[PDB]
Design a protein around this motif. Sequence first.
Motif, mmCIF file in Angstrom:
data_model
loop_
_atom_site.group_PDB
_atom_site.id
_atom_site.type_symbol
_atom_site.label_atom_id
_atom_site.label_comp_id
_atom_site.label_asym_id
_atom_site.label_seq_id
_atom_site.Cartn_x
_atom_site.Cartn_y
_atom_site.Cartn_z
ATOM 1 N N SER A 29 -7.618 26.100 137.661
ATOM 2 C CA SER A 29 -8.657 25.756 138.628
ATOM 3 C C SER A 29 -8.970 24.285 138.554
ATOM 4 N N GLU A 30 -9.456 23.774 139.672
ATOM 5 C CA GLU A 30 -9.915 22.411 139.775
ATOM 6 C C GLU A 30 -10.944 22.347 140.911
ATOM 7 N N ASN A 31 -11.726 21.273 140.920
ATOM 8 C CA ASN A 31 -12.679 21.037 141.987
ATOM 9 C C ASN A 31 -12.769 19.548 142.266
ATOM 10 N N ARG A 32 -13.448 19.213 143.345
ATOM 11 C CA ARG A 32 -13.654 17.827 143.692
ATOM 12 C C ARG A 32 -14.876 17.712 144.602
ATOM 13 N N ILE A 33 -15.518 16.550 144.587
ATOM 14 C CA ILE A 33 -16.635 16.287 145.469
ATOM 15 C C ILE A 33 -16.175 15.469 146.666
ATOM 16 N N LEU A 34 -16.450 16.017 147.845
ATOM 17 C CA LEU A 34 -16.079 15.416 149.107
ATOM 18 C C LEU A 34 -17.324 14.931 149.797
ATOM 19 N N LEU A 35 -17.254 13.705 150.316
ATOM 20 C CA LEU A 35 -18.316 13.125 151.146
ATOM 21 C C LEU A 35 -17.862 13.093 152.618
ATOM 22 N N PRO A 36 -18.516 13.879 153.490
ATOM 23 C CA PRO A 36 -18.150 13.909 154.898
ATOM 24 C C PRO A 36 -18.277 12.564 155.562
ATOM 25 N N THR A 37 -17.401 12.276 156.509
ATOM 26 C CA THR A 37 -17.525 11.044 157.265
ATOM 27 C C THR A 37 -18.661 11.184 158.288
ATOM 28 N N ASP A 38 -19.061 10.082 158.910
ATOM 29 C CA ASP A 38 -20.088 10.149 159.957
ATOM 30 C C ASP A 38 -19.552 10.744 161.271
ATOM 31 N N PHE A 39 -18.273 11.118 161.291
ATOM 32 C CA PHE A 39 -17.689 11.810 162.441
ATOM 33 C C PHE A 39 -17.169 13.191 162.087
ATOM 34 N N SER A 40 -17.589 13.722 160.946
ATOM 35 C CA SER A 40 -17.206 15.049 160.504
ATOM 36 C C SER A 40 -18.190 16.019 161.129
ATOM 37 N N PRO A 41 -17.709 17.073 161.798
ATOM 38 C CA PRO A 41 -18.632 18.132 162.237
ATOM 39 C C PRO A 41 -19.447 18.803 161.116
ATOM 40 N N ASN A 78 -12.190 9.407 112.562
ATOM 41 C CA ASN A 78 -13.058 8.768 113.564
ATOM 42 C C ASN A 78 -13.061 9.468 114.918
ATOM 43 N N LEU A 79 -13.673 10.656 114.961
ATOM 44 C CA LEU A 79 -13.947 11.348 116.223
ATOM 45 C C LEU A 79 -14.835 10.495 117.111
ATOM 46 N N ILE A 80 -14.317 10.057 118.247
ATOM 47 C CA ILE A 80 -15.095 9.234 119.165
ATOM 48 C C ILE A 80 -15.889 10.126 120.123
ATOM 49 N N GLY A 81 -15.218 11.120 120.687
ATOM 50 C CA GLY A 81 -15.827 11.960 121.704
ATOM 51 C C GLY A 81 -15.118 13.279 121.923
ATOM 52 N N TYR A 82 -15.894 14.282 122.317
ATOM 53 C CA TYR A 82 -15.379 15.599 122.655
ATOM 54 C C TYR A 82 -16.094 16.049 123.943
ATOM 55 N N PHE A 83 -15.330 16.304 124.999
ATOM 56 C CA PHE A 83 -15.901 16.587 126.316
ATOM 57 C C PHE A 83 -15.238 17.792 126.973
ATOM 58 N N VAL A 84 -16.012 18.460 127.833
ATOM 59 C CA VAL A 84 -15.515 19.491 128.760
ATOM 60 C C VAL A 84 -15.625 18.930 130.177
ATOM 61 N N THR A 85 -14.579 19.115 130.978
ATOM 62 C CA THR A 85 -14.576 18.605 132.356
ATOM 63 C C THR A 85 -15.462 19.438 133.294
ATOM 64 N N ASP A 86 -16.347 18.779 134.041
ATOM 65 C CA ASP A 86 -17.231 19.486 134.963
ATOM 66 C C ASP A 86 -16.742 19.385 136.400
ATOM 67 N N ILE A 87 -16.185 18.230 136.748
ATOM 68 C CA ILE A 87 -15.612 18.011 138.069
ATOM 69 C C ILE A 87 -14.272 17.297 137.878
ATOM 70 N N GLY A 88 -13.225 17.946 138.365
ATOM 71 C CA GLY A 88 -11.867 17.481 138.237
ATOM 72 C C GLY A 88 -11.044 18.699 137.905
ATOM 73 N N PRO A 89 -9.997 18.519 137.077
ATOM 74 C CA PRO A 89 -9.272 19.668 136.577
ATOM 75 C C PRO A 89 -10.203 20.475 135.669
ATOM 76 N N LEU A 90 -10.353 21.752 135.968
ATOM 77 C CA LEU A 90 -11.333 22.592 135.290
ATOM 78 C C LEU A 90 -10.691 23.377 134.166
ATOM 79 N N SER A 91 -11.535 24.020 133.342
ATOM 80 C CA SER A 91 -11.148 24.576 132.022
ATOM 81 C C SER A 91 -10.283 23.577 131.214
ATOM 82 N N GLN A 92 -10.793 22.352 131.148
ATOM 83 C CA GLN A 92 -10.172 21.228 130.475
ATOM 84 C C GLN A 92 -11.137 20.716 129.384
#
Lengths: 105, 114, 104, 105, 105, 104, 105, 105
Positions: free
Chosen positions: A91-103, D37-51
């Motif tokens: 799975s994956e997701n993304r944030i889309l910003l509609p254009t000013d001409f998007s229905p 030297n662990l710098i960071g540990y993260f879970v992806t919220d937006i993008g490729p998911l279950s990452q």
Amino acid sequence: HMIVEERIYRIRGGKMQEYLKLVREEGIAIQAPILGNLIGYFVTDIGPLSQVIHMWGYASLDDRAERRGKLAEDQRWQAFIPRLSVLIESSENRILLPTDFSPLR
Amino acid sequence: SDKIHHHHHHMIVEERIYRIRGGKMQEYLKLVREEGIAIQAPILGNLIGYFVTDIGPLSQVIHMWGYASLDDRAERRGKLAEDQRWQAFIPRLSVLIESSENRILLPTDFSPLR
Amino acid sequence: MIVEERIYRIRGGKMQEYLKLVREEGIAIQAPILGNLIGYFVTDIGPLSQVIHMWGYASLDDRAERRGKLAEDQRWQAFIPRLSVLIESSENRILLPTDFSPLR
Amino acid sequence: HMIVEERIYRIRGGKMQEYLKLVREEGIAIQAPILGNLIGYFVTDIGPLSQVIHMWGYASLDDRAERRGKLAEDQRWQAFIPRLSVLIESSENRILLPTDFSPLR
Amino acid sequence: HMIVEERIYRIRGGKMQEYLKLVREEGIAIQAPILGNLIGYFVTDIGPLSQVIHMWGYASLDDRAERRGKLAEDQRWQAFIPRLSVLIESSENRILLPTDFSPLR
Amino acid sequence: MIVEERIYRIRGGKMQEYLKLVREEGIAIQAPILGNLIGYFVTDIGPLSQVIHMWGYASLDDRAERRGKLAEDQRWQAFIPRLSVLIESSENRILLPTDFSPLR
Amino acid sequence: HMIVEERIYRIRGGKMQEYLKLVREEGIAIQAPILGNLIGYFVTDIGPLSQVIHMWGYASLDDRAERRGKLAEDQRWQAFIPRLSVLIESSENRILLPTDFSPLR
Amino acid sequence: HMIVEERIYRIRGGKMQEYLKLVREEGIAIQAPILGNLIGYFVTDIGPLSQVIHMWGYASLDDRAERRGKLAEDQRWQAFIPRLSVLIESSENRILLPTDFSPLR
């Protein structure tokens, strides 16, 4: 001002009808009220196969987080989501910003 | 907000996904805003949405088009290719596109857009 | 706190040029406005001609507001076109630190 | 100078919270002292998911090798890692070199 | 124990023969003595196309960094590489560890 | 001479089992029949849980014949299902050494 | 017996028509006699766009090697290919083996 | 004019011969009549591996949609397809338009 989340899942081979039934019969009735604006829900016919795409609209990104937060702690969703997750290969997701001409905007 | 349906009408949705060349997003957008969508939409007949990705693959445009069937799509896309204003417009847009792909989506029977 | 990871592929041969622009002009403009640069990296093993930079924010609203401020900044607007022509591809994602992330 | 290894993992559908529990309660206490030297540990919220994404700092690559070799011979890690590994669908890594204007350096 | 670096370049369409000429006639004579151990240099015939692969042997990754750093500082390389880099559309690398049954180890 | 590069992604947790199978059983069957193993590697930095092996051939018709013999070998038919179940994805390519490639 | 080669190219945006004009009017009359068995030449309408696919039939891969050699060394091809190559963004290929129930076989 | 669909599947490791047996012995006899124009059926030998490719010719996308509708509804096919699908790791399709100079057109 409105934002759109597109979620794109790759479903395990042979499990598509299973996946849709759970969402059709249980999942969407819980999820939609909480998240507030299901725009569309699709199964790809041509392109990447065994693929579902769903789009959700939100007033803002912090409205989104508040709603998605409410969903994560909903008891029915907590019971439901493990049964759906076992059928999802990636799975994956993304944030889309509609254009000013998007229905949809 | 909510949608309401009483009878089925068959509809397919095409998703087109373009990666735009770096530095060209506002030029791409301006062409479509000011010229292209005024030609394109009346002909193809059902524009659904038109987006620029803010989190995900970037320099990315996504647009969705509703059609009754894939032959209807073919008919309408052929009229567009055949339109004189489009023929003068599309080469200026296409040069700004690094990659493109499309796909055909079938709405579920529980999709609000359907 | 959330971390945005931005990942750019730079045009072959233009890496030093890109870094020069950022080092000498870009980062001075960008960093104060966005608030919290975490790291800025050039890949040595992996996908190559790859730059990765990380930015911290309080929320996605906060990010949107700051990046909008950046887009409205005259210096940034004069600068970013020179940088954009060296970028072949770009993507980003939002990372939530875990409760055991020393950075969180 | 210092180098950063970024490790990017795809976790199996529905196993994210299982994976985190293992790392939170066992793995990280073993791994961190040894690797240094662990710098960071993260879970992806937006993008490729279950990452998940984790970053590790080293003074040099030869030092990375020494320390990752130490980790692999540690008997607790050996007992632990197979339980983590069965939850990982895909994995990859890369070596990032900080710029002279990177706060993490 | 030795390590192997595989470097993988995609060359701009129509530029392959030009790329190969630069390496054959100028680049490799500078590059190989300094890096120390060119294993193989290849053009893909079936697979991803307009692709070159080249493999380098090193005693350790710190040795690799020391030698690659020397290459970068060399006057002749510096006058050369900009003419090669303009032909490279994309690149990547990885570090391979030979197995105990690998003829190259 | 031709070089085939085969690139496998191994199921998570199964690497040691993959190497044990090949080390103790597989490669003793395979190498004599295929004829010219060049290298066999595990990736340490890049795509992970990844195995790469290179094979030298006089021509692609020779390769097809030799890989044909291999697939008909009784011992290999007894071995390959145990190895194959461990491979999550695979790919290969044909590489033509340049006239300045030491391996040629 | 017969093997199939599938070649898959991505064409620079806006150059498709120019690419086909070149191939239709000059390229394919050189290329197809020398290679011997063009199965098919396609443009993608749904899927990855700005994509051409051509399939070549060969008796064996040695015969392919010989014939592709002849093409590369052909004076007409050499005058033609640079002009097509400038329009190609990326390319790849693969060898396909028809099953015993493939009508094309 | 005629349109071609290319379906491309990644089969699970070790399951190829099991895939082909099913299609050879049961699947193709059900499927080929109903869809009407099997062009080719291939297994990849060099390229992406554990890959099956098949091609189907159609007069129109609607006519494709009708025949795939009949195929889906066919009861023997409904019994067959779950058994094939369990072996498929991923799938994808695209619609190809033969050039006016493609022998297959």
